[PDB]
Design an enzyme around this catalytic site. Structure first.
Site, mmCIF file in Angstrom:
data_model
loop_
_atom_site.group_PDB
_atom_site.id
_atom_site.type_symbol
_atom_site.label_atom_id
_atom_site.label_comp_id
_atom_site.label_asym_id
_atom_site.label_seq_id
_atom_site.Cartn_x
_atom_site.Cartn_y
_atom_site.Cartn_z
ATOM 1 N N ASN D 1 0.820 -1.207 0.000
ATOM 2 C CA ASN D 1 0.000 0.000 0.000
ATOM 3 C C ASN D 1 0.854 1.258 0.000
ATOM 4 O O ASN D 1 0.360 2.342 0.323
ATOM 5 C CB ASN D 1 -0.951 0.009 1.205
ATOM 6 C CG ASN D 1 -0.279 -0.414 2.485
ATOM 7 O OD1 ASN D 1 0.930 -0.261 2.634
ATOM 8 N ND2 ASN D 1 -1.057 -0.921 3.426
ATOM 9 N N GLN D 2 2.109 1.134 -0.409
ATOM 10 C CA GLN D 2 3.144 2.103 -0.099
ATOM 11 C C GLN D 2 3.128 3.273 -1.082
ATOM 12 O O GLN D 2 2.580 3.183 -2.185
ATOM 13 C CB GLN D 2 4.470 1.372 -0.139
ATOM 14 C CG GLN D 2 4.573 0.342 0.959
ATOM 15 C CD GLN D 2 5.896 0.322 1.645
ATOM 16 O OE1 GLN D 2 6.320 1.311 2.213
ATOM 17 N NE2 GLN D 2 6.557 -0.828 1.624
ATOM 18 N N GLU D 3 3.763 4.376 -0.683
ATOM 19 C CA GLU D 3 3.739 5.626 -1.449
ATOM 20 C C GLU D 3 2.320 6.062 -1.770
ATOM 21 O O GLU D 3 2.021 6.564 -2.850
ATOM 22 C CB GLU D 3 4.546 5.511 -2.738
ATOM 23 C CG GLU D 3 5.850 4.759 -2.668
ATOM 24 C CD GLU D 3 6.707 5.144 -1.483
ATOM 25 O OE1 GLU D 3 6.518 6.238 -0.917
ATOM 26 O OE2 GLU D 3 7.606 4.364 -1.138
ATOM 27 N N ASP D 4 1.443 5.897 -0.793
ATOM 28 C CA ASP D 4 0.048 6.254 -0.985
ATOM 29 C C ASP D 4 -0.555 5.487 -2.159
ATOM 30 O O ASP D 4 -1.316 6.033 -2.958
ATOM 31 C CB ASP D 4 -0.097 7.767 -1.174
ATOM 32 C CG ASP D 4 -1.483 8.267 -0.839
ATOM 33 O OD1 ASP D 4 -2.040 9.035 -1.642
ATOM 34 O OD2 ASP D 4 -2.034 7.869 0.205
ATOM 35 N N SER D 5 -0.179 4.219 -2.283
ATOM 36 C CA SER D 5 -0.983 3.236 -2.989
ATOM 37 C C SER D 5 -2.047 2.725 -2.027
ATOM 38 O O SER D 5 -2.255 3.288 -0.950
ATOM 39 C CB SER D 5 -0.116 2.089 -3.510
ATOM 40 O OG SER D 5 -0.922 0.995 -3.902
#
Ligand SMILES: [Mg+2]
Ligand SMILES: [Zn+2]
Lengths: 87, 56, 156, 134, 44, 56
Positions: D1-5
């Site tokens: 879910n990283q980097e505002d995924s």
RNA sequence: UUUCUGUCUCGAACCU
């Protein structure tokens, strides 16, 4: 004119191999092996020409030379067998 | 500036990017479709004849 | 002499001259002793888009050409006296292809499809359910007529 | 879910979350190229000498439309138009290569000038995927 | 059942070389309904 | 492509889905954020080209 | 036993 060429002595460039020379040589051997050139090393089932090229460079069994162009147009003439591929 | 310094080229793709911690640092995931379209010209040798015949 | 050349719209020059004279003659018929001083007007075909007019002062041509379309009164120039003889000189100018099918040994079984291409021993079908093309052996597909109903195996 | 995924629940996706319909419409006109010369919306045929496309043509029926209910993809032709040449040639508009779906509707009418004008509308379900933005 | 009207909601079953107007009403939008071929979907 | 490390050679991993996947730690030199960003994959067509991209 | 379509040009809106 050959006077621009430097003989085997009095060469001032580095015997230590440059990453760009390494990359070009691996690529050139890669074309040669991919297009049915002879292979200078015993093959233990290797099938990727780039890997075969790295193996030959590791054993210093690459029949290639480098004109090391001095920017004035003269060149220093350096053989792959003698080029210390340390990195 | 528009056709010589920078120009166009085939053998290329563009698409969205997603994070992936289960991928090696120097690795990159390619969609199956993009792999199906993009090609590398590989030359026939004794050392890949069997795999290339299988691919064909 | 006093001779001034005026820009105008190309190709209609004779119509301009004819209208200018009809205006002049009507002005003479209405006017008495004091007539407008326009010695003559003419054009040139091969130097198209231009008129030449003789008159003593510019106000005469302005008071003549007001209300005349397709003439650029703003754009006028002197003809040199030396230039006139040369300007006025006389000498100038597979049955399975495209059929509804049902797949039978695959994950997409029981699914309608349309055969798009056949590469030999393997038929590509666009699924009549999913937005995806799939390759599957053509022998193991039961083909259907244009409408639904009886399902015929590969014997046609 | 990283980097505002984001990590989205697949069970929710395929039970109804954030699905949508995509409608796309195409147009064609029976433009008057040559006095007393008009195209006829019909099925092109290989028998006459036309520059037809490599996409499928069976989707068309004799009328020149795709018999709504049928569906399409890739380079299937949606309206079947033949322009006379002075035997004739193809001018049918193909479906978009990257988009595909089922034909929801088709319209046939006369435009201001009386040339026949056709408006074909194609429907698709479009489900959340990884690359989809939210 | 080749075509249906937009307001009259009536069949026309017309052929080529005919006007594209509804016979019942003045309107000439002239939709047409689903094909007679079987169409199949899943719930996915 | 503001700076030098914004163009790097990666090893393909064919991966069935519609989106490029890339290791997360390579987002810094690319200045990537997976927030709808898109990225660009260029496939070499020669053994020279592959050797340059792998070694340099 | 009959296949390598295909475009420009002025903008507008939006994404990173
Ligand atoms: Mg971003
Ligand atoms: Zn009606």
């Amino acid at each position: 004119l050959k006077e621009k060429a430097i003989p085997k002595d009095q060469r001032a460039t580095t015997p230590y191999m440059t990453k760009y020379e390494r990359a070009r040589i691996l690529g050139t051997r890669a074309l040669q092996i991919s297009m049915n050139a002879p292979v200078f090393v015993d093959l233990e089932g290797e099938t990727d020409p780039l890997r075969i090229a790295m193996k030959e460079l590791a054993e210093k069994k690459i029949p290639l030379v480098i004109r090391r162009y001095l920017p004035d147009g003269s060149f220093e003439d350096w053989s792959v067998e003698e080029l210390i591929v340390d990195l | 500036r528009g056709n010589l310094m920078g120009k166009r080229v085939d053998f290329s793709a563009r698409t969205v990017i997603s994070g992936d911690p289960n991928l090696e640092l120097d690795q990159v995931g390619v969609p199956k479709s993009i792999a199906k379209t993009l090609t590398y010209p590989e030359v026939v040798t004794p050392y890949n004849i069997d795999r290339l015949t299988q691919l064909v | 002499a006093t001779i001034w050349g005026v820009r105008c719209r190309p190709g209609k020059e004779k119509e301009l001259i004819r209208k200018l004279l009809k205006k002049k003659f009507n002005l003479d018929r209405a006017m008495g002793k004091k007539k407008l001083k326009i010695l003559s007007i003419f054009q040139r075909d091969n130097y198209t888009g231009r008129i030449y007019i003789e008159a003593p002062k510019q106000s005469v041509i302005e008071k003549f050409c007001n209300g005349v379309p397709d003439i650029y009164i703003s754009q006028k120039l002197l003809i040199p006296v030396q230039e006139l003889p040369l300007l006025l000189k006389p000498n100038l100018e597979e049955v399975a292809l495209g059929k509804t099918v049902r797949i039978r040994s695959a994950g997409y079984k029981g699914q309608l499809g349309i055969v798009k291409d056949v590469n030999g021993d393997k038929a590509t079908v666009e699924l009549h359910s999913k937005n995806k093309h799939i390759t599957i052996d053509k022998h193991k597909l039961t083909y259907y007529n244009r409408e639904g109903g009886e399902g015929i195996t590969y014997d046609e | 879910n990283q980097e505002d995924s984001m990590i989205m629940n697949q069970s929710s996706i395929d039970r109804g979350l954030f699905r949508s319909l995509f409608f796309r419409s195409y147009m064609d006109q029976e433009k008057k190229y040559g006095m007393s010369i008009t195209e006829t919306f019909e099925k092109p045929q290989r028998t006459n000498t036309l520059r037809m496309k490599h996409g499928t043509y069976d989707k068309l029926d004799d009328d020149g439309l795709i018999a709504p209910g049928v569906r399409v993809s890739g380079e299937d032709v949606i309206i079947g138009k033949t322009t006379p040449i002075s035997s004739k040639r193809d001018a049918s508009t193909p479906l978009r290569s990257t988009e595909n779906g089922i034909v929801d509707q088709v319209l046939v009418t006369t435009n201001q000038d009386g040339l026949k004008f056709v408006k074909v509308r194609v429907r698709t379900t479009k489900i959340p995927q990884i690359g989809d933005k939210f | 059942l080749k075509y249906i009207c937009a307001e009259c909601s009536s069949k026309l079953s017309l052929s080529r070389t005919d006007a594209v107007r509804c016979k019942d009403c003045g309107h000439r939008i002239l939709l047409k309904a689903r094909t007679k071929r079987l169409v199949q979907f899943e719930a996915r | 492509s503001l700076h030098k490390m914004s163009m790097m050679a990666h090893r393909v991993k064919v991966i069935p889905y519609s989106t490029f996947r890339l290791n997360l730690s390579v987002t810094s030199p690319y200045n990537a954020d997976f927030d709808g960003d898109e990225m660009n994959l260029h496939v070499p067509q020669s053994e020279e080209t592959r050797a340059e991209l792998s070694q340099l």
